[PDB]
Amino acid sequence: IDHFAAKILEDWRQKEKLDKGALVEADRVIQRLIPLSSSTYVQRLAAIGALYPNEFTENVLDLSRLSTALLQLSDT
Amino acid sequence: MWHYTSINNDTRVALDPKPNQIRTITKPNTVPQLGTDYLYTFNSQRRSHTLRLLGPFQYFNFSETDRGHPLFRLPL
Amino acid sequence: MWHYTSINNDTRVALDPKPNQIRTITKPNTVPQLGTDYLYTFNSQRRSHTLRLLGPFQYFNFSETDRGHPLFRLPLKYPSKAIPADELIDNLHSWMRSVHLLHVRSEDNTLRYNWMLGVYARSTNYTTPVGQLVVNAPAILNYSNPQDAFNSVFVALGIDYIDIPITNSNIFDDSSTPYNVRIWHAPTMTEVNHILALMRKSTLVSTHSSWHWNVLHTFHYRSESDMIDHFAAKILEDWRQKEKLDKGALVEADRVIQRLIPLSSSTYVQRLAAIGALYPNEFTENVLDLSRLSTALLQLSDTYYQHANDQLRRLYRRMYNDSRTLYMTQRHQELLLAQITADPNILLYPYTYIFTTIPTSMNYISNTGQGRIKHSLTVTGATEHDTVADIVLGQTGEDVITISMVEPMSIAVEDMYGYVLDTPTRDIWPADEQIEQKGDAVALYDTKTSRALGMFNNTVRIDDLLSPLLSLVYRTYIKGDTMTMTQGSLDHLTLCAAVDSDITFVGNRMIAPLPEGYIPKPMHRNNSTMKMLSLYVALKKLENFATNSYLMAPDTSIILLGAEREPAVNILRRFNRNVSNVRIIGMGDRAVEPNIRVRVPFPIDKNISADFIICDINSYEDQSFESMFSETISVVTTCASAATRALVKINHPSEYMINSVIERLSQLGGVFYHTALLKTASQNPYSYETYIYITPIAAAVRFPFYSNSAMINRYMTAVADDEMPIIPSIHTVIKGHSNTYSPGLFCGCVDVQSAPLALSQLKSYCSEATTWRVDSDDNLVNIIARIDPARIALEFRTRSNTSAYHEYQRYVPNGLGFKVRKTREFRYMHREVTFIHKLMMYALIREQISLTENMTQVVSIGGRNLADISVVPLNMKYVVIDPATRIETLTQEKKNIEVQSRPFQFDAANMDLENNSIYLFIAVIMNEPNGAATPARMQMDKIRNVATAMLTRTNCVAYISFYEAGIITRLDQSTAHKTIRVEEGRLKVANYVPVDTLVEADVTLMLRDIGITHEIIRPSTPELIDACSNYGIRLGSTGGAVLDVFNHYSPVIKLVR
Amino acid sequence: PVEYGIFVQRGATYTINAAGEFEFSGRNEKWDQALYLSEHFPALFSDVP
């Protein structure tokens, strides 16, 4: 969960920088992980993670407790 | 400004040194320098020390012999 | 200057003291002193101590009792740090007091004391037969004739030789000695011959060409490696010496041939002796690496063993088969003969041969030591190439090269706070013009401006551009190293923008020292902070221009209307702490405290007013154009109503939008609003966003509307691109003469042997190329070279592939760089605004030229060093008529380029304009060839002359660049112009003399009177993007502000027939 | 232990080069007498600082 969280954060920051149209040295185009076998909660992280939800650009999530916020976001 | 402009690259490969550079990769003759060879920070609030080697060394597994070195004994 | 002049002398004999001087030779009464009695050095890197006694003591054997002294125990007592001079001096002093050499002082002035045998006998504690002979009869150590000093003791002992140990030079090492020096009883030359010939039948022995004390002495090595390292050092010594002799300087050579003569050795030593006696050119050229000398020497020998030169190869072979013979050039031999004529019984090595030195023409460039080489590759050379194979560049680690995205700006702190104006020009705004401008503005807003322009805007952020400068102010203030500055100074405002803590001067021009132990956190700035600061400075300069202090006047207020955290309000509040009563507040819809959170238009109940307003409102949401229009109108209206000096942002500065603003300001009752467009240096360099500046004045403003304003043109000319933005590639494979490269840069490494070839191949693309090897041992040579479109436009004009490869092979191996430090290239290098405008004008003229059909030639009068070459197509013939242009008839003939090399006559009778020709007059019209500025009436005269002269020929197209007058009005009111100026009313671009400007209306009126077709074009945003994408150039900030008003006021007349 | 680590990183043995420079193995290996006739030397006795 904590790994998936950090990677989701990285891909969201990256996609945010890409969408602004700036040239960027993305080491890999989709920074976030792809679970192959995991619990439910990881699958939720992967899901909202792939949504690139508006809430991250708006800073509606609290990043201090990232995965928790991510789980919460998923529920909505 | 729709289409993304990004320069993809295998950054982790670019980090691997040429074989000729390995002998002097530790820079044996000179003192390691802060902000180039390392980053040390002491968070007085959490009272946690944090060293972080830069360059190729950012990825370094430590042998149990390496752990026996006084350097790692320093935070105690 | 052939014959050598050297004064030979037995230096080792001169060192031996008179017997009377031995008693006080240790200087018992006084402390040994550094630099005279000793040399101590602590090499902190290798952590090795090194003591070295001077004078007679440089040769001192130590008794095991002497080693027991605490002095020698000292380096162990200080494993990591230098021995303090106190302890070193006291220990060396007491140990020096302990030594005493047996001797008998005498009256005769001819005596010398045999220091070698004295100290040697002392070291063995007088146990060996020489030690006994000395302790019993110390007077034996005194000698008149140097040789008899030893003959006396060989005769006394009956021995044929003494095997004497060598001292180490450093007295701290206790390492077992590589060799020892035997000393033979051989009084005459015949005995010397017999001993040498016997020595040539025994392992690991060698000797000098001549001997000190005129007594034969042989070196006897413990192992082959020791013989090698000794032979190496001696070869180095003789090569340095012969080099000094060949320069013809008088030199005190202690012995004419410094290098050793093996009598019996392994093969490798015989190779050292051979190349050593060659005195090869490579040493003078520094082609060898001296850090690993013997290795290099062995290597050199191998090439000489198989040398392409038959002479050097047969010579080296010969020297290798006769290693016992000493080889010397004639100029040495005369010195030997002089040395014999001076002292007839001098002993020197019997078996010698006098070879003639073989000349070699290869003048290698070289330089050991740090420093990358910054090559400037030639377009052409003596060498011809035929179908050179593609040269792959190696992968490089980040330990050597890194590629940062954008070069950070270097700049003075004041330069950041500058700004440019653009005043309104039109006297009226007719309704058809309104409908046209609205149609263009709606069509433009409806589809977003160019994706490439937005890329540069999103990569060349101002925050990152100014970070290296701003943080530097933090690090200096943090050490207390920063000091004097004025209260209101821009350096003070930068200091406020660096650190979160309040700063206060202790008095006039002197900031307070930091409280002890305190390290204040650097101020947090978002991307728009510095821009807001420069807008503050802008409003200050606009309220009055003479001011140096930028503090607010007491009892006044300012509002930063767009706000989040708005760090700028805090920095500004901090800036004005010493000023009484100054309201300062942000007031955005997203505002956090201190700033009030509120929507604009202001709620009807709320009362707001200030002496200054700095709006930065910008809707994040996507929205209809009519909504954005009404919103910006209400924003400018509310901003103008609330202050005597508004400074509104305009996100979409179309002509229609700004004119709507002035019209709406016109509709408000009772106040005539003077206005001006504006652009600060702290804006992102590429943003088209523009700050309109409203302010009431008593008079109604003549010419209130805008048309073709530069700030507006920056936006309006940008449009959706027909092509994707050009991402800068990093090339590795250098094809020989290919022209398939997208803009970017070559970057990689090659074997040092291939390196001359690779440079010769990439001269086809890159105009210059840095190179270096990481270290003397690593054979790969790194290269970086960005691709110049101008060099491609030059080199690909014809199929010939000449290069200076013959010159480049003078570089291998030491002649092309060393740098242990990591280097960091940028994908987007800095360039001055003049150069950028020049490149933009070139892009405009080149795209303009490709459209033109059936023209035989381009003629760039005033072309300098082929500056306009990027413009002309690879096909059509190119011509230059700059008097100052250098001629290169080989380059001209090979590349299809005529060069007139004479001043061009503008007079219509003298004019010789061809049919089907494109005449470039870029920036030449404003200057005489000698560089003095031509008066503006003369400029208009020569333009008229080119016009009438081309009026007759049916197919021609002139491009007369010039400076429009209006710019002098604007730079008189602007600040950000580190490059451009207004000395006495004339523009002063770069280092050029100030030069009077034409007015566009008079020029167009003149061209209409002439009757020739014309069209006064100037380069636009897409042209700028093309120049930047192609050349790899980021704009920079000051250039970003000045470039629009500068570009608009360098019109390019386009005469056409 | 510290100096030992620093020492044995250079190598447990060495060999003289044809150029006469020393070349240490870089490896920490126990010595055997089979090496006495080899190109190899014990590194403790190199007397190289």
Ligand SMILES: Nc1nc2c(ncn2[C@@H]2O[C@H](COP(=O)(O)OP(=O)(O)OP(=O)(O)O)[C@@H](O)[C@H]2O)c(=O)[nH]1
């Ligand atoms: N023990 C001892 N050795 C000496 C003394 N003087 C000279 N030598 C050695 O004699 C050797 C040959 O003497 P020189 O021909 O005068 O000098 P060199 O061969 O050029 O060697 P260096 O001058 O020492 O570099 C050198 O290696 C010296 O170390 C001495 O007074 N005592």
Ligand SMILES: Nc1ncnc2c1ncn2[C@@H]1O[C@H](COP(=O)(O)OP(=O)(O)OP(=O)(O)O)[C@@H](O)[C@H]1O
């Ligand atoms: N955020 C979510 N993403 C995907 N599936 C979910 C999510 N929340 C619940 N589900 C599915 O619906 C069911 C709801 O379970 P329930 O809400 O009682 O407890 P939970 O699984 O811990 O979820 P929550 O954390 O919302 O309580 C789960 O079995 C799960 O499969």
Ligand SMILES: Nc1ncnc2c1ncn2[C@@H]1O[C@H](COP(=O)(O)OP(=O)(O)OP(=O)(O)O)[C@@H](O)[C@H]1O
């Ligand atoms: N630089 C040289 N000077 C004189 N003789 C040489 C040189 N190099 C080789 N020879 C002779 O030619 C032979 C070549 O031997 P080989 O090159 O296989 O190994 P080597 O002697 O170590 O030389 P290298 O170091 O060039 O390999 C040797 O026996 C030697 O006698």
Ligand SMILES: C[S@@+](CC[C@H](N)C(=O)[O-])C[C@H]1O[C@@H](n2cnc3c(N)ncnc32)[C@H](O)[C@@H]1O
């Ligand atoms: C581009 S931001 C720059 C603000 C300021 N320069 C800063 O960052 O410190 C402009 C801000 O203005 C705010 N804004 C937009 N419309 C507004 C309105 N109608 N009235 C007041 N504020 C508004 C937005 O919320 C946005 O955050």
Ligand SMILES: C[S@@+](CC[C@H](N)C(=O)[O-])C[C@H]1O[C@@H](n2cnc3c(N)ncnc32)[C@H](O)[C@@H]1O
């Ligand atoms: C101002 S400089 C630079 C011009 C422009 N930047 C370019 O490179 O094309 C103009 C050059 O034109 C040359 N020149 C000046 N007067 C000229 C004249 N009357 N006829 C031909 N060349 C002239 C000068 O030698 C000068 O180097």
Ligand SMILES: [Mg+2]
């Ligand atoms: Mg990663």
Ligand SMILES: [Mg+2]
């Ligand atoms: Mg000497």
